[PDB]
Amino acid sequence: NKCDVVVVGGGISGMAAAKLLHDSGLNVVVLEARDRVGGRTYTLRNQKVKYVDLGGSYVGPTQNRILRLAKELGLETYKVNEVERLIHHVKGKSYPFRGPFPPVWNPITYLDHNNFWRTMDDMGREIPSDAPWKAPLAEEWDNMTMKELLDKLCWTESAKQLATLFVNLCVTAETHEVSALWFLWYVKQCGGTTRIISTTNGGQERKFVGGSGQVSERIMDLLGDRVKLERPVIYIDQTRENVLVETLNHEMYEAKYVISAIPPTLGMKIHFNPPLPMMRNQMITRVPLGSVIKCIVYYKEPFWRKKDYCGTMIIDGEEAPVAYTLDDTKPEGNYAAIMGFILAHKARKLARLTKEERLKKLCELYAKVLGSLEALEPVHYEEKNWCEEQYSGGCYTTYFPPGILTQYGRVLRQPVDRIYFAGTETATHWSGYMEGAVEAGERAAREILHAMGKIPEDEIWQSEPESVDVPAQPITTTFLERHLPSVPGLLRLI
Amino acid sequence: NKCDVVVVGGGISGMAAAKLLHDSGLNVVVLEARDRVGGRTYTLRNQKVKYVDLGGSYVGPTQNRILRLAKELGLETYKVNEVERLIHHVKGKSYPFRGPFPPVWNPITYLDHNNFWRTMDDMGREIPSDAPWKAPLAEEWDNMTMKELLDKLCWTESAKQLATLFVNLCVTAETHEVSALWFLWYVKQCGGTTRIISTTNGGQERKFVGGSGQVSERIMDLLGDRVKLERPVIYIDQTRENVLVETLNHEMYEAKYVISAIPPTLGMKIHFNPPLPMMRNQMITRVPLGSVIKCIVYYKEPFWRKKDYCGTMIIDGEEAPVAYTLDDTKPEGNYAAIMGFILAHKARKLARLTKEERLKKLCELYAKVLGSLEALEPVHYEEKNWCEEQYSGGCYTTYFPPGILTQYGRVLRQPVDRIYFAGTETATHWSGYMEGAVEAGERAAREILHAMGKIPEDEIWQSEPESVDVPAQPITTTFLERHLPSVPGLLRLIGLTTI
Ligand SMILES: *Cc1cc2c(cc1C)nc1c(=O)[nH]c(=O)nc-1n2C[C@H](O)[C@H](O)[C@H](O)COP(=O)(O)OP(=O)(O)OC[C@H]1O[C@@H](n2cnc3c(N)ncnc32)[C@H](O)[C@@H]1O
Numbered sequence: 001n002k003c004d005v006v007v008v009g010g011g012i013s014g015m016a017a018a019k020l021l022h023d024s025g026l027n028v029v030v031l032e033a034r035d036r037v038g039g040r041t042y043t044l045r046n047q048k049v050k051y052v053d054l055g056g057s058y059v060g061p062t063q064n065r066i067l068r069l070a071k072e073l074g075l076e077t078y079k080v081n082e083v084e085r086l087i088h089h090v091k092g093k094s095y096p097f098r099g100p101f102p103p104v105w106n107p108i109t110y111l112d113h114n115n116f117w118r119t120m121d122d123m124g125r126e127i128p129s130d131a132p133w134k135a136p137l138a139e140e141w142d143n144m145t146m147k148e149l150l151d152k153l154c155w156t157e158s159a160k161q162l163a164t165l166f167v168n169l170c171v172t173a174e175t176h177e178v179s180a181l182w183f184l185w186y187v188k189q190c191g192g193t194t195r196i197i198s199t200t201n202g203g204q205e206r207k208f209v210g211g212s213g214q215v216s217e218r219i220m221d222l223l224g225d226r227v228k229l230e231r232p233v234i235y236i237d238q239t240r241e242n243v244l245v246e247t248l249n250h251e252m253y254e255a256k257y258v259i260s261a262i263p264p265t266l267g268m269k270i271h272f273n274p275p276l277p278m279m280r281n282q283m284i285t286r287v288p289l290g291s292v293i294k295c296i297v298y299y300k301e302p303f304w305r306k307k308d309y310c311g312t313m314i315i316d317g318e319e320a321p322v323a324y325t326l327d328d329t330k331p332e333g334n335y336a337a338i339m340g341f342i343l344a345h346k347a348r349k350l351a352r353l354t355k356e357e358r359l360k361k362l363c364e365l366y367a368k369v370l371g372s373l374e375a376l377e378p379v380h381y382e383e384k385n386w387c388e389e390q391y392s393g394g395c396y397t398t399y400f401p402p403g404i405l406t407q408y409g410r411v412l413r414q415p416v417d418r419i420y421f422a423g424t425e426t427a428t429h430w431s432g433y434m435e436g437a438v439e440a441g442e443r444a445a446r447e448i449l450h451a452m453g454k455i456p457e458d459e460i461w462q463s464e465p466e467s468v469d470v471p472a473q474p475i476t477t478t479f480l481e482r483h484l485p486s487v488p489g490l491l492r493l494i
Numbered sequence: 495n496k497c498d499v500v501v502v503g504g505g506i507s508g509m510a511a512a513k514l515l516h517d518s519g520l521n522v523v524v525l526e527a528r529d530r531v532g533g534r535t536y537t538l539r540n541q542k543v544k545y546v547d548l549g550g551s552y553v554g555p556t557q558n559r560i561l562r563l564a565k566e567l568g569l570e571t572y573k574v575n576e577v578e579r580l581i582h583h584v585k586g587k588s589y590p591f592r593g594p595f596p597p598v599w600n601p602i603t604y605l606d607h608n609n610f611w612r613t614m615d616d617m618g619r620e621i622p623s624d625a626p627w628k629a630p631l632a633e634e635w636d637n638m639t640m641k642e643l644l645d646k647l648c649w650t651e652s653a654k655q656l657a658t659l660f661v662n663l664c665v666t667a668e669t670h671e672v673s674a675l676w677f678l679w680y681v682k683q684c685g686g687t688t689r690i691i692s693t694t695n696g697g698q699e700r701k702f703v704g705g706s707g708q709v710s711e712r713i714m715d716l717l718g719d720r721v722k723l724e725r726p727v728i729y730i731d732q733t734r735e736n737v738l739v740e741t742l743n744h745e746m747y748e749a750k751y752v753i754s755a756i757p758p759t760l761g762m763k764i765h766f767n768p769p770l771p772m773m774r775n776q777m778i779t780r781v782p783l784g785s786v787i788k789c790i791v792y793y794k795e796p797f798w799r800k801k802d803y804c805g806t807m808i809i810d811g812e813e814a815p816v817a818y819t820l821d822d823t824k825p826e827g828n829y830a831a832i833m834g835f836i837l838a839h840k841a842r843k844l845a846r847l848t849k850e851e852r853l854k855k856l857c858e859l860y861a862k863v864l865g866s867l868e869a870l871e872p873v874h875y876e877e878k879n880w881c882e883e884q885y886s887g888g889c890y891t892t893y894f895p896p897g898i899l900t901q902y903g904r905v906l907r908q909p910v911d912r913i914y915f916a917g918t919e920t921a922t923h924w925s926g927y928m929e930g931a932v933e934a935g936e937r938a939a940r941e942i943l944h945a946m947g948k949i950p951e952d953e954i955w956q957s958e959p960e961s962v963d964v965p966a967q968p969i970t971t972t973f974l975e976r977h978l979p980s981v982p983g984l985l986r987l988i989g990l991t992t993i
């Protein structure tokens with residue numbers, strides 16, 4: 001019944017918040033709707049796969065909070081395989097390459113591609129990470145979709161196809177679904193185009209040995225019986241001295257403060273007394289999550305490596321079910337596997353099929369792209385469609401349709417009386433990722449410590465020392481990349 | 495706790511559904527979250543106003559279901575005042591006019607305005623009322639906002655300005671917030687541009703004597719103790735032979751079937767066992783309601799009539815808090831009043847002020863638009879910001895952002911095991927309105943009667959005889975309206991002769 005703080009949600013953010021408060025000497029309780037912890041992370045274990053991340057998996061340089069938390073819990077990382085060549089498959093042909101950038105051979109098309117990525121980062125430099133609505137052109141950019149921006153910027157269909165894939169893969173949503181301002185903020189707050197797309201020296205550099213689900217699991221181990229599973233919160237009452245929190249299974253909890261560590265829209269599943277302020281009331285109806293099926297096909301051997309391919313495939317176009325893959329083989333070289341994402345509208349379309357039907361489509365696609373009949377002989381298959389999850393709403397994260405971020409963005413982390421807001425969606429660096437989940441959970445926890453008079457105001461937001469295990473190398477550009485003209489810039493010189 | 499059908503929501507749609515089922519001999523229960531029925535309709539009564547609709551109010555020709563239901567319940571309508579001139583206020587100046595269309599004198603501007611409304615209706619004719627996602631260019635149109643479509647179509651700032659106000663006023667949302675396909679559907683399913691904008695011969699022709707809240711109240715009277723107030727539904731369980739419905743105040747109800755008669759996104763407030771199918775699970779996170787404050791300023795007399803103004807003002811410009819007003823005086827001629835809407839972003843922006851501050855801003859605006867110092871002397875004020883409502887989510891209705899209607903639209907009224915879906919959002923004619931609430935409630939009820947083997951399949955969807963009290967004049971166009979060129983059409987003709 002009685003405690004200092006109730007945390008709603010036992011994903012990484014809620015767990016990180018509860019741990020910090022617990023370590024500080026407060027009595028905490030975590031109320032989790034599911035029969036498991038981890039939320040948008042989920043590590044499946046069976047003999048065929050050993051373990052596999054069906055939700056969030058990747059960590060990399062500059063994500064120092066998640067790396068520090070995992071290390072403390074006794075976890076280690078290994079590198080996602082990028083020794084051999086990456087593949088860009090365009091108009092029915094595979095083009096192997098090295099470096100983070102797919103090569104472009106046509107000179108006009110080259111200028112167009114170069115300008116697109118450069119312009120994304122140029123625009124990002126004017127968007128504050130902690131307040132994107134304060135961008136000088138916030139309203140102009142928020143009132144446009146990414147489709148509109150791409151249509152204006154890309155003079156070649158080639159650039160437009162890759163730019164579209166980029167949007168789809170970053171935020172599991174269609175270019176026409178999302179605000180340009182929000183999307184440009186999203187990329188900038190991960191460190192820019194190069195950092196977000198990169199395996200080596202980027203967001204996809206590493207995975208956790210044994211799976212990312214261990215983060216939430218091991219914190220639940222540390223919290224004893226303070227984690228309550230199968231307790232979906234249904235009601236929060238702030239009319240009295242202590243806050244009252246009621247669960248679906250009829251239990252009542254009493255606390256001084258609450259942390260909401262669930263996706264913003266899932267706040268709708270809770271009935272509030274008194275009602276929420278107008279702006280939050282409407283905000284939580286305006287913020288959907290994206291759509292994705294994560295699919296892992298297993299093979300006897302990582303056969304692609306013999307052809308000097310690392311397993312990374314970037315696959316343009318409408319026909320392909322999967323637009324992007326990475327090698328999911330274990331560090332020992334066993335449990336050979338390819339991870340692929342079925343993105344946005346394709347998640348919706350292909351959900352109608354059977355598991356076996358999807359397996360066949362993926363195997364035939366991979367056989368074409370890798371140029372190998374070995375892709376047609378899988379030994380095992382696992383997948384998860386995150387669109388079906390009542391207590392997630394989708395994956396990877398929440399996207400903002402046009403007009404929403406400028407009108408409602410401010411209220412995302414604004415406290416409501418004694419309710420404070422965590423969740424990766426409220427982070428200012430790697431929001432959308434496990435890193436942002438840690439940042440937001442610890443910040444929300446420290447807001448409460450400050451409310452209790454335990455720490456000063458300047459300690460609410462705290463820097464993180466760089467990981468020694470996963471250090472970051474700087475992102476560089478070339479002289480030509482910085483100074484080559486766009487297509488219309490070349491036209492104006494003519 | 496045992497019944498045949500549980501209806502979730504006691505707005506017009508749930509009440510219409512419950513009444514039909516009750517009349518058919520079934521045992522119904524209505525579970526309503528609030529301490530009142532009516533939902534997005536709410537009639538305030540006090541001595542200063544007598545009565546006033548703070549939510550949905552207007553009915554008109556072609557809305558035959560709401561008119562028939564209200565008539566059966568003993569209600570009467572009266573006509574909104576449109577005897578005198580309307581006002582279009584643009585660039586700080588007022589232009590009085592008659593007819594549904596603000597006058598446009600500049601011939602280029604006239605062609606552009608004519609073509610804009612014509613094209614809205616032309617495109618609408620391509621969109622099936624019962625399946626907008628089946629339009630030939632559904633995907634192209636759904637992947638565009640209304641802002642993009644206006645930018646393409648309007649060759650004058652004058653047309654773009656009025657078109658923007660039109661969207662804001664129809665759906666309480668910004669042009670950049672909404673899908674072009676969805677908005678084009680929304681207008682077409684109300685009968686088109688002329689019908690949706692008109693007072694005389696359109697959606698705003700009439701109000702109910704005594705207020706629209708009487709519709710839901712009188713149905714509650716008919717149903718007696720079957721309506722349960724302050725029972726917000728939290729949980730629906732379909733894993734066993736009969737459906738189990740749990741409320742916040744700790745009550746359990748058992749039923750053969752359920753009708754969900756709440757705004758689609760408010761489905762999120764219910765925990766489902768088993769979980770909803772993927773498409774509905776995501777759909778209910780993708781469908782917000784609009785933003786509006788409805789404001790009524792009272793005066794000693796309807797002084798605007800003396801200057802040959804009916805009370806209708808169409809007000810363009812960022813600075814104006816209210817973009818549209820109608821005379822709200824009682825049919826007897828007393829309790830003189832102006833009704834105004836604060837729309838979309840302005841509802842958000844102006845919510846920060848006090849009630850007294852909003853009243854001052856409205857009076858100052860009305861004084862300028864009407865050229866009348868008497869507008870600075872209000873005797874009373876009432877208002878309601880629908881953005882603050884936990885159990886509405888907004889008003890008037892649900893809008894669809896770009897890309898959503900084609901991807902998720904088909905599941906809006908698709909049954910989920912033994913749950914059937916009512917609510918105005920699921921209607922095919924005047925969706926968003928009290929009329930659509932009746933259509934959807936009665937249709938959902940008949941879906942259940944069919945499932946029980948009580949009526950044949952062809953009786954699920956039923957036509958409605960035209961009101962004898964509110965006849966519908968047809969929507970007509972002139973030869974010139976049909977065949978005058980667009981601005982680019984004129985330019986093509988110019989470039990053709992110059993050869
Ligand atoms: C789904 C997904 C996510 C993902 C990704 C691929 C997929 C398919 N790949 C990632 C990656 O490679 N690297 C990375 O860093 N992130 C990746 N992501 C996203 C990542 O998983 C998320 O950013 C992160 O997991 C989010 O953490 P957070 O703690 O903020 O949120 P959550 O996991 O959703 O946890 C919320 C918990 O709350 C519970 N819940 C929901 N409603 C209630 C109620 N009413 N009462 C009590 N509890 C509730 C949820 O069940 C959940 O456990």
Ligand SMILES: *Cc1cc2c(cc1C)nc1c(=O)[nH]c(=O)nc-1n2C[C@H](O)[C@H](O)[C@H](O)COP(=O)(O)OP(=O)(O)OC[C@H]1O[C@@H](n2cnc3c(N)ncnc32)[C@H](O)[C@@H]1O
Pocket residue numbers: 502503504505506507508525526527528531532533534535548549550551552553725726727728755756757760763764786788880885886888889890891916917918919926927928929931
């Ligand atoms: C708000 C508004 C609406 C409006 C308008 C002006 C404003 C300011 N002008 C209109 C007009 O002039 N003419 C017209 O025909 N319509 C106008 N509108 C729209 C109109 O009010 C709506 O279309 C109509 O009232 C909607 O009816 P419907 O029955 O479909 O929906 P509802 O009124 O919202 O009723 C839903 C009920 O369900 C209850 N609820 C919500 N959640 C729960 C849960 N969890 N459990 C139990 N009950 C629940 C709500 O409280 C409500 O009563």
Ligand SMILES: CCc1ccc(CCOc2ccc(C[C@H]3SC(=O)NC3=O)cc2)nc1
Pocket residue numbers: 058100101102117162166169170171193194196197198203204314
């Ligand atoms: C800047 C030039 C460029 C343009 C597009 C691509 C194709 C690959 O793009 C990517 C885009 C996003 C991501 C990150 C994706 S992958 C994941 O697990 N989670 C993510 O957020 C990974 C790769 N490569 C290079």
Ligand SMILES: CCc1ccc(CCOc2ccc(C[C@H]3SC(=O)NC3=O)cc2)nc1
Pocket residue numbers: 552594595596611656660663664665687688690691692697698808
């Ligand atoms: C076709 C040419 C034209 C273009 C716009 C206007 C300005 C008025 O536009 C209107 C637009 C919508 C509405 C209906 C609004 S008012 C209400 O109570 N609920 C509604 O849906 C009423 C008027 N007049 C004429």
